[PDB]
Amino acid sequence: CTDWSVDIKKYQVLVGEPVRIKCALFYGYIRTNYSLAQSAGLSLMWYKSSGPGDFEEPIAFDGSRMSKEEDSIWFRPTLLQDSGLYACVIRNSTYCMKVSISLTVGENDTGLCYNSKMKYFEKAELSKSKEISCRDIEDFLLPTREPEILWYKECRTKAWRPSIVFKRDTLLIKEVKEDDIGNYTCELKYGGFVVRRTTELTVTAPLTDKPPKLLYPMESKLTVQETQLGGSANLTCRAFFGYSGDVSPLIYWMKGEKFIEDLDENRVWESDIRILKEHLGEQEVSISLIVDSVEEGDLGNYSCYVENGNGRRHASVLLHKR
Amino acid sequence: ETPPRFTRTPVDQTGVSGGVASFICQATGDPRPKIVWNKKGKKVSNQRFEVIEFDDGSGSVLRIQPLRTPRDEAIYECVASNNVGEISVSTRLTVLREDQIPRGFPTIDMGPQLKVVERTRTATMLCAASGNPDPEITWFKDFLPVDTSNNNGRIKQLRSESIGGTPIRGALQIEQSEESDQGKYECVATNSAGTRYSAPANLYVRELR
Ligand SMILES: *[C@@H]1O[C@H](CO[C@@H]2O[C@@H](C)[C@@H](O)[C@@H](O)[C@@H]2O)[C@@H](O[C@@H]2O[C@H](CO)[C@@H](O[C@@H]3O[C@H](CO)[C@@H](O)[C@H](O)[C@@H]3O)[C@H](O)[C@H]2NC(C)=O)[C@H](O)[C@H]1NC(C)=O
Ligand SMILES: *[C@@H]1O[C@H](CO[C@@H]2O[C@@H](C)[C@@H](O)[C@@H](O)[C@@H]2O)[C@@H](O[C@@H]2O[C@H](CO)[C@@H](O)[C@H](O)[C@H]2NC(C)=O)[C@H](O)[C@H]1NC(C)=O
Ligand SMILES: *[C@@H]1O[C@H](CO)[C@@H](O[C@@H]2O[C@H](CO)[C@@H](O)[C@H](O)[C@H]2NC(C)=O)[C@H](O)[C@H]1NC(C)=O
Ligand SMILES: *[C@@H]1O[C@H](CO)[C@@H](O)[C@H](O)[C@H]1NC(C)=O
Ligand SMILES: *[C@@H]1O[C@H](CO)[C@@H](O)[C@H](O)[C@H]1NC(C)=O
């Protein structure tokens, strides 16, 4: 049997809410859908694993809580002991394929309505619009106005400002503010069970349109560092980077046409980039240039380079004998 | 005695800045050929350029990480030689900026994860990638390419049959796991637009109970 191990989509839910586990093989791995598999004479079976590698007793479905509907498993409601991997198997007499599906069943964090290690994550820029959605609610979706989905902030009801617009399963912030940071919770009724999903929101500056800013050393002055022959020299460059996304900051030393990071030597070398200050999501970073036994060839111009999607800037230092 | 002859030549690559690029070169001959990587006739020498040798001695891999543009962008060559003869093959490296990345460049939707298998049991590393055109998924272990060439092998490659909408599923299946299988695996997604690496994932092999 060709085993695909654990599928990418993982199910994690709060003990007591209904959850339907679809078989992954149809929704990615194999081309056809369920009815066609049956028609073509293939079997579908579900087995439960406690983890990797524990081996699988078949599922003892009843018909009420743990039903085995068409192409999926339904839990109504979820139980704590339901946590585990659920292997979904398909069979010919000459063909077999299976994927396992993770199902994690957590508890409310103490005093809170979510589980910390069980949360969605989003990001938004200040002064721009963000849209938080309630997911994954596809199955508990109803085509009527009622019941409606209630949104909490820090697991508590609040009087929402009017710039915040609500539609059926989404929350819209027309202009994000630092206050809008934090844990948003959607709540839905169905079953009648209660389905809750919380997304944590982190906020950053808007995407900056300016190159980064040199501090140590400065973009005009030719600063000077004094050193002795046969000593060590730590030429530290310090720069500010605006928010350009999930990219790491590009700061590096050169020596004329020569890049330091491109030199296989034990005499000269850059340090690793240090992040000295970080605040949503703007950084002050530091990279330093080390020379361990100062030869006369070492002396002279070094220039720290700093790059961003908006540009490249550099500042120079002169290294010289005492 | 026979002169060196290539069994595997490097192919042009288009990578993305900060990422990885690997060039593969394998040759055979008697005596065993040495392999050297050059740029404009000069043997490469660079902290970000690493040459990793196969255990066979059949060749080497030239790995560049992290990729820098436009410095790394260039024509490189593999040269294989012994006292009987010499052969060389050229290859191009292109590096794009993430801002410059085209619609339809491979992305790693999910990459391999830490896995612990006991000896002689099957271990599977999974990789999900998408792109336009649909990316081919390949594997590297400890910086060398995993060879799944031979069918009926201990190590096999699985590929999603692919409906249109979802990422492509790829897997590396290692039957009868042994201590030598332990190591750092990374998945690689490639299409006509370029090449992308997943983050590394270690596979551990603990003793069979
Ligand atoms: C290269 O030089 C930089 C500059 O730091 C120096 O600071 C003064 C004490 C004087 O000696 C100055 O002449 C010089 O500018 C060094 O960077 C610094 O590194 C240290 C880590 O060793 C940082 O200190 C703290 O370490 C504690 C752990 O005990 C942490 O908890 C702190 O959060 C913090 O990291 C320090 O912040 C940092 N400063 C700057 C400005 O970068 C650097 O170590 C030195 N050598 C290299 C880079 O190889
Ligand atoms: C075993 O089944 C395969 C067909 O596999 C598929 O099964 C489902 C997952 C779904 O995708 C169905 O639509 C498919 O039928 C049979 O092998 C196929 O035979 C055809 C004959 O023309 C060939 O074109 C395909 O390539 C074959 N597929 C594979 C994977 O080899 C096979 O006949 C079935 N065996 C029995 C005993 O019924
Ligand atoms: C959103 O919830 C998270 C927890 O899910 C909060 O993060 C906690 O912050 C406190 C601050 O002192 C820490 O002591 C905890 O360890 C944090 N927990 C986790 C899991 O990170 C966070 O404070 C909440 N956000 C807001 C705006 O209240
Ligand atoms: C999926 O199954 C349906 C029946 O539910 C069938 O009509 C359809 O043809 C199948 N999918 C495709 C792509 O044909
Ligand atoms: C469960 O979550 C609710 C929020 O609706 C909370 O009031 C309750 O205290 C939580 N349970 C425990 C044991 O903390």
Author numbering:
A (entry chain B): 31 to 352
B (entry chain A): 28 to 236
What do the authors say?
Vertebrate type-IIa RPTPs comprise LAR, PTPσ and PTPδ, which share common domain architecture with a single transmembrane (TM) helix flanked by a large extracellular domain (ECD) and cytoplasmic tandem PTP domains: the membrane-proximal PTP domain (D1) is catalytically active, whereas the membrane-distal PTP domain (D2) is inactive. In mammals, presynaptic type-IIa RPTPs form trans-synaptic adhesion by specifically binding to their cognate postsynaptic organizers through their ECDs for inducing synaptic differentiation of neurons. To date, five different types of postsynaptic organizers for type-IIa RPTPs have been reported: interleukin-1 receptor (IL-1R) accessory protein (IL-1RAcP)7, IL-1RAcP-like-1 (IL1RAPL1)8, neurotrophin receptor tyrosine kinase C (TrkC), netrin-G ligand-3 (NGL-3)1011 and Slit- and Trk-like (Slitrk) family proteins. To elucidate the structural basis for decoding the ‘splice-insert signaling code' in the type-IIa RPTPs, we determined the crystal structures of PTPδ-ECD in complex with IL-1RAcP-ECD and IL1RAPL1-ECD.
To elucidate the structural basis of the PTPδ–IL1RAPL1 interaction for trans-synaptic adhesion, we determined the crystal structures of IL1RAPL1-ECD in complex with PTPδ Ig1-Ig2 and the full-length PTPδ-ECD at 2.7 and 4.4 Å resolutions, respectively. Description of PTPδ Ig1-Ig2 will be based on the 2.7-Å-complex structure, whereas that of the other regions of PTPδ-ECD will be based on the 4.4-Å-complex structure. The Ig1-Ig2 domains of PTPδ retain the binding ability for IL1RAPL1-ECD, as shown in our serial deletion analysis of PTPδ. No substantial change in the backbone structure of PTPδ Ig1-Ig2 occurred upon binding to IL1RAPL1. The interface between the IL1RAPL Ig1 and PTPδ Ig2 domains comprises both hydrophobic and hydrophilic interactions with a buried surface area of 699 Å2. These interactions occur on two β-strands comprising Arg181–Ser187 and Arg196–Glu202 in the Ig2 domain of PTPδ, between which meA9 is inserted. The first eight residues of meA9 (188Glu-Ser-Ile-Gly-Gly-Thr-Pro-Ile195) form a loop connecting these two β-strands, whereas the last residue, Arg196, extends one of the two β-strands. Trp34 of IL1RAPL1 hydrophobically interacts with Leu153, Ala198 and Leu185 of PTPδ. The Arg196 side chain forms a hydrogen bond with Asp37 of IL1RAPL1, which is further stabilized by a hydrogen bond with Tyr59 of IL1RAPL1. The IL1RAPL1 Ig3–PTPδ Ig1 interface is overlapped with the putative binding pocket for glycosaminoglycan chains of heparan sulfate and chondroitin sulfate proteoglycans, which mediate axonal growth control though the interaction with the type-IIa RPTPs19. This third interface is formed primarily by hydrophilic interactions: a positively charged cluster comprising Arg75, Arg95 and Arg98 of PTPδ forms a hydrogen bond network with a negatively charged cluster comprising Glu291 and Asp292 of IL1RAPL1.
